[PDB]
Design a binder for this molecule. Structure first.
Ligand SMILES: O=c1[nH]cc(F)c(=O)[nH]1
Ligand SMILES: O=c1[nH]cc(F)c(=O)[nH]1
Ligand SMILES: [Zn+2]
Ligand SMILES: [Zn+2]
Lengths: 449, 452
């Protein structure tokens, strides 16, 4: 088995059970997993490759828990930059009706590359449109080429124009076809073993874009197959009113009534989750993907993340799709979580270590994994290093960890995912990034024009 | 005088009176000024150097209107990261008491380098501590090394611990000495001419950090000398209560009472400015430096920027000191202004072009300058270029301008300040940046290990 030693980090942030932050720390890797973490004599360990991390901070790889990677082809569309969410959807859906399998494959790589260079080693996605023969398989193909640990969601919608919804009919599917494809994807791709690089989750776009029968049947299938459940919930005032008018229930009551609570469930946004919903989520272990930049850029609101954390809700972090952020920058999203909670709820609402915990342990938690999210013996070899001697962090070496959240760092210097060194001295190793960016921009131009 | 042609930008954002955004745009420069702005007809122009900007967006240089660059030596101090503003001040003041002239000279270069690589071509600063023989001269020396267009404020404090204030006495000054040094700095350094690289403003830290007499005499001096006035105003709930309690007045009423209104005045933050204060500022031309990251990082609040703009208030942008942001990233601050107004006031509150106008034309206005802030014949040759073919902007070429605000771009590819190409292919040309960063971090270490 291949061994790898990362030695003499200026600070090794473990996020482990003691929250050890080790000066001069070293990390010994064998295959895809961590052998030991420490300073002192472990730094003298022989290894097939040694990488010198003096002057760097090492953190556990960031974990992104919500995205729509296909939207990285359609950032800052003029008719979608401003205005109401109604106009945003109505101007973007006809564009997305042109998506091809190749664009799914390429856009997954582009969005994952942006996340990887900004500190992220595991990401979910929420692909929920399948025009022109597009399949989740195309996104899985792209993810496999770039080497990121991947939770692929079988997103779905069934309520289109003919049934009184907003999406064009060409962007919705029959519900029997959705369940059959969901089952196929689990059988073909879901790896439930420790250190899995690919897991499947089932994800109707929202409880309102599919039938209530399909929400219950999806939950049933996920529980039978041992996979997770993901959807958008309580993202804005319109979601809350819709739930009340149409079902006589708050969004959280609606989720509970469908069986969409539990540690195998995580809901994106939850900006308008109420006190009873927070408590329900806390006692059922239901997770939340917090997407601060999206919630600001779409004027959704400030999610009550501090209140959720204070009751024991499992909270992870997500960038959301690139047409509603529009960046894909994980460490910048972690910064935004801290800034937004403080402006919303005061100076004690979120510090650097609490935000970074959401970005690491919190994300592992809401994806229902205990093998990622911190650095210790037997954990997955997922971690990143930032150079502390850059201009961006000059004067911030008083606390290298806080520097990543309070300052604006550049790209990571190194990234390791499943023991593979995927970024070396700021250069992505698993793909030809300039070629992918070129193809992406040509495809984006073809799609929109 | 040297001539420069910048040709074939994918998009040249002028911010001019017609807000032209020119595909294939070109810029012809002579010395410190723009000779022409146009399309490919400019390619027939002769120039000493041509720079090919295809694949790039060019924008007017961003203008930063509030800072404390000395704080770039003390980012994320553990005891100041969290807690109340009281704890922030009382844990940072003893550290700043060890500042030396060399630290002022170096920290100015570090803070300006961060601003320049993130799109900024003009900055003010608000140095308000002068321990151990430090002088505004030291900051001016650093700014002259790096080539940034500079509005240096003689900040001041006189109400210390022994007199019932929070700063220690070693960090406050006698008020007559403050006025004397203010006049010396104006006479020695303030260049009032077009395309000036150095202007002086007078800047008591807040209306409560000095006597009422110093507030009034400082304004009197500034008006006599023709320079501007700068201070912190209405940053938080404590500022509003204090002025109401001690003076029976809102912060903006108190500023008016002190004579601290007018187009030669700009107030930092104004988070808690009320409707009548907004109206007052609009009709007097009083400016505002909006500091969104600082206002969130210190839990100050969401300033009513959309309301001020709708009433006619001149609003610029500021990163604030690096101990309350803690970044110095001008284009990221522009993004934050847009994100924060939307979450505060709805989807119509601020778009990419509105935010970029605050960061350019808005900053020129609050600094009382008509020669920077947009690209047109006779304007200062201050502009920057971002590469549009980066991973960060992939899929955003549908609107190159909005991409700068809605995405998170890297450093600029090129920067021109006063006609000098100060950043070339991402590399800062005017200082040895890794050497300055090394010295900065070493001085930061010496500073925090001082005996106190
Ligand atoms: O912000 C968003 N809301 C709803 C959606 F379906 C989506 O893709 N993005
Ligand atoms: O936010 C701030 N408040 C007060 C200060 F003196 C300062 O520098 N910054
Ligand atoms: Zn989403
Ligand atoms: Zn300030």
């Amino acid at each position: 088995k291949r061994t790898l030693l990362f030695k003499n980090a200026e600070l090794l942030v473990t996020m482990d059970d003691e929250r050890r932050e080790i000066r001069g720390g070293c990390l010994l890797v064998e295959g895809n997993r961590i052998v030991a973490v420490g300073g002192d004599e472990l730094c003298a360990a022989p290894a097939d490759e040694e990488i010198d991390l003096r002057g760097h901070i090492v953190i556990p790889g960031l974990i992104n828990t919500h995205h729509h990677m296909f939207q990285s082809l359609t950032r800052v569309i003029p008719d979608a930059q401003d205005g109401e969410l109604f106009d945003w959807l109505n101007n973007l859906y006809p564009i997305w009706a042109g998506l091809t399998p190749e664009m799914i494959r390429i856009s997954t790589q582009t969005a994952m590359a942006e996340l990887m260079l900004s500190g992220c080693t595991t990401s979910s996605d929420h692909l929920y449109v399948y025009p022109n023969g597009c399949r989740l398989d195309d996104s899985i193909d792209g993810a496999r080429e770039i080497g990121m640990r991947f939770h692929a969601c079988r997103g779905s919608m069934s309520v289109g124009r003919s049934k009184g919804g907003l999406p064009p009919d060409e962007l919705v599917e029959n519900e029997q076809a959705i369940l059959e494809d969901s089952l196929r994807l689990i059988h073909s791709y879901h790896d439930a073993q420790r250190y899995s690089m690919l897991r499947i989750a089932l994800a109707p776009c929202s409880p309102f874009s599919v039938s209530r029968e399909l929400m219950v049947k999806t939950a049933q299938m996920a529980r039978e197959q041992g996979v997770s459940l993901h959807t958008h919930l309580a993202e804005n005032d319109s979601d809350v009113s819709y739930s009340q008018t149409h079902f006589g229930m708050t969004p959280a009551q609606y989720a509970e009534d469908l069986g969409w609570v539990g540690s195998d469930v995580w809901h994106a946004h939850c900006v308008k989750l109420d006190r009873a919903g927070i408590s329900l989520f806390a006692r059922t272990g239901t997770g939340v993907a917090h997407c601060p930049c999206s919630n600001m850029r779409l004027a959704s609101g400030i999610a009550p993340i501090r209140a959720m954390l204070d009751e024991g809700v499992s909270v992870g972090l997500g960038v959301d799709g690139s047409a509603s952020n529009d960046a894909g920058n994980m460490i910048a999203e972690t910064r935004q979580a801290m800034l937004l909670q403080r402006v919303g709820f005061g100076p004690d609402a979120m510090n650097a270590r609490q935000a970074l915990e959401i970005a690491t342990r919190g994300g592992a938690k809401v994806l229902n994994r205990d093998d990622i999210g911190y650095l210790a013996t037997g954990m997955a070899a997922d971690f990143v290093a930032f150079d502390l001697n850059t201009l961006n962090l000059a004067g911030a070496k008083h606390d290298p960890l806080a520097a990543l959240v309070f300052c604006t760092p550049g790209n990571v210097a190194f990234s390791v995912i499943n023991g593979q060194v995927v970024i070396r001295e700021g250069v992505l190793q698993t793909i030809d990034l300039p070629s992918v960016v070129q193809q992406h921009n040509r495809l984006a131009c073809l799609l929109v024009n």
